[PDB]
Amino acid sequence: MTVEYTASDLATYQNEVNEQIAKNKAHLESLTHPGSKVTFPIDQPNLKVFFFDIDNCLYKSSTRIHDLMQQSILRFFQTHLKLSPEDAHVLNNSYYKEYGLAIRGLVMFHKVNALEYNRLVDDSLPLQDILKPDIPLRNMLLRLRQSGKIDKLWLFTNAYKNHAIRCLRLLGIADLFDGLTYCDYSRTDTLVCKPHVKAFEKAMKESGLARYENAYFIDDSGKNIETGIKLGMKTCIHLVENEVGQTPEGAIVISDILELPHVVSDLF
């Protein structure tokens, strides 16, 4: 939109975002529950690694998050003339599912500054209004961790690291993983993200996995699962919460991450 008070408006939007981010951080600082702090470093034999997508996987897809994200994108759209209405419409449908992949084209063609977008749209979101400590989840992941069958639980996400970290802390599962592979929005206009092969190569390198046959993978994106299968991962699990992209042949199909011990019980 072309407005009367452009400068005062953008400052106001940025100032509101500043205040909300400060509140978001203060909230995290207040947490004292198990799993409320990251216990692994960032950007660091027959090793077995289980890779986990985060969004819509470690928590159930939320229309509240979709709606909050849409409102956020709407405010961004109104203030950034480089985005078309179709760009914004597609983001409304896709960003809260695909994260970095959803902005990859926009970033490559310089219609969106990734860090600016992440701050105003993503880091601004009061995720604590939706994501709460999940004890059954914690207990399931701990069960996997302690079973003696898997060496590392590794996060593998298209979100930027702070979004990913917030999710782990809010859900009370931040001490259950050994590391995090995220989509780096910071200093390239060519984002590396799933389902692209280079994202998998990054996850392999960072986790220290040597052989795809020693990898396990759970994700809600059929196409991501497909890359995993074709790379030769041992078992890929396609999470489809609502059976309303297809499931690639060879994937196990589940509707809730708590189904995991009942579909790959050998690992538990």
Residues that bind Na ion (CB under 5 A): 53, 55-56, 220
Quote the least distance from Cβ 223 to Cl ion, whole Å: 15
CA pair distance 50, 157, nearest whole angstrom: 13
Decide: 75 and 120 in contact? Cβ < 8 Å.
yes
Q: CA angle, corner 256, sides to 67 and 132, nearest 5?
A: 55
Task: List all residues 6 or more positions away from 214 whose beta carbon is below 8 Å from its beta carbon.
Answer: 46, 47, 48, 49, 234
Please say which residue, 55 or 175, places its beta carbon nearer to Na ion: 55
Residue 109 near Cl ion by CB under 5 A = yes
Quote the least distance from Cβ 107 to Cl ion, whole Å: 8
CA pair distance 192, 181, nearest whole angstrom: 11
Across the chain, which distance is largest between two alpha carbons, in Å?
A: 64
- Among Cl ion, Na ion, none, the one that 220 touches (CB under a kind-dependent 5 to 8 A) is Na ion
Decide: 254 and 261 in contact? Cβ < 8 Å.
no
Within 10 angstroms of residue 233's Cβ, the number of other Cβ atoms is: 23
How many residues comprise the chain? 268
Please say which residue, 59 or 76, places its beta carbon nearer to Na ion: 59
- Among Cl ion, Na ion, none, the one that 109 touches (CB under a kind-dependent 5 to 8 A) is Cl ion
Residue 105 near Cl ion by CB under 5 A = yes
Among 53-61, 105-113, 168-176, 233-241, the segment contacting Cl ion (CB under 5 A):
105-113
Quote the least distance from Cβ 268 to Na ion, whole Å: 22
Please say which residue, 102 or 264, places its beta carbon nearer to Cl ion: 102
Decide: 52 and 218 in contact? Cβ < 8 Å.
yes
Please say which residue, 97 or 152, places its beta carbon nearer to Cl ion: 97
Question: Phi/psi of residue 259, each to 5°?
Answer: -75, -10
214: nearest Cα among 48, 64, 29, 21: 48
Please say which residue, 209 or 225, places its beta carbon nearer to Na ion: 225
- Among Cl ion, Na ion, none, the one that 105 touches (CB under a kind-dependent 5 to 8 A) is Cl ion
- Among Na ion, Cl ion, none, the one that 210 touches (CB under a kind-dependent 5 to 8 A) is none
Within 10 angstroms of residue 187's Cβ, the number of other Cβ atoms is: 7
- Among Cl ion, Na ion, none, the one that 245 touches (CB under a kind-dependent 5 to 8 A) is none
**Cis-peptide into 34, omega within 30 deg:** no
Please say which residue, 15 or 188, places its beta carbon nearer to Cl ion: 188
Per-residue contact string for residues 54-93; x = within reach of Cl ion by CB under 5 A: ----------------------------------------
Quote the least distance from Cβ 106 to Cl ion, whole Å: 5
Interface residue list for Cl ion (CB under 5 A): 105, 108-109
